[PDB]
Amino acid sequence: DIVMSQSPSSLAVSAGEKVTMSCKSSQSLLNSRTRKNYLAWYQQKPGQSPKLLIYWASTRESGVPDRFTGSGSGTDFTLTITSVQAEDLAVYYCKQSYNLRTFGGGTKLEIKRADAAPTVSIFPPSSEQLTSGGASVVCFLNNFYPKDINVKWKIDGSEGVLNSWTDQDSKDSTYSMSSTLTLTKDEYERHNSYTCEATHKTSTSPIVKSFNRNEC
């Protein structure tokens, strides 16, 4: 069958630096009739469809930046990105069309940038939720780098949580995370102080955001 394999699985590169990624096929993709390699590269940015970048191994599609170059032949192929930009964050797939079609497993390109502290916001439950008998408390930790972050919830001073990270931002290369604590209304109404505390490598001091039910 034709097995397509890519390397690395993932990597991170700083803007302005060079990116190199590899694609191997189990059979030569060099078509003897046309003497071209039937190997294409696609870029898939977060939440978007794949977009054609390169085909016949080295032909750059119109509208694709000069910084993307495809190379190689037979069983081994390379996509090179020079002077990588923040917007280049994506999964990159190679695909053979020598015999039907088969995609590689992809390479995830992340962007390395300077450490950045999160901006933290806390939100009390809405009255339209409380009327239903539930109480969700939400904390947004926005625009930070790197991705690893710790969130603790404290209720009346002591430590049902959904955490979600965004994909990296295409413009500033930061991450954001939402943490949701869900309680029953009966439990919510027993306590006064609700606190989310974010600890990130950017400070030894946790960022603490809080509200008190009596001040609502």
């Binding site: 469809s49 794949p50 977009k51 039907l100 939400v138 959904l162 954001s176 949701t180």
Partner: protein
Amino acid sequence: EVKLVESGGGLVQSGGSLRLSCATSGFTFTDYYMSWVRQPPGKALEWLGFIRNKANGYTTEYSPSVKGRFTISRDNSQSILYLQMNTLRAEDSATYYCARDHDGYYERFSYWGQGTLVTVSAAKTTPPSVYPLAPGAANSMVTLGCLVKGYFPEPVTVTWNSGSLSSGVHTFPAVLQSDLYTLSSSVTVPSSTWPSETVTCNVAHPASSTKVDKKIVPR
């Protein structure tokens, strides 16, 4: 302008069937092979099959992963591509894309649709509750949000001010917890602009045909 648009995705039970469509314009449809490609959430693209062009008699080919279970057809009068899926299983849950394929000359998929999400599950459709996130008691900038809680299946769409607020928006990927998804979206604006101007999140959950506008009101 080339357009490809998939439709027909949604929730179906294991063992069930579903047919997807892909409407096209902006090119000579019969000149082109057309492929279907799927992608399970967070996983790689998988080529499924193609149907050839007029020159090659509109014959079909399939990955062994789906041969005998999926069928590709095309309406050449209307420039529409179809995928008939039978005996669906958990592993078929994925975004399905149509892609314009070979023309006899170029080896490339030049264009792809936006994709349509198929969920194979016994779970019921459940519309979201949508709750505003307004600051408590608590700056140059202000951050607001909406919490889109307890829905099934994916997806939902979230916009702010009918898409006029796009900068400074973050939508947090849905997380599944005890059989329902919850997602949230944040928007950051200058505090001189809210609450003096209206900020509203617009939420749609196609499986339940839910449409919600939730104005973010100061407490």
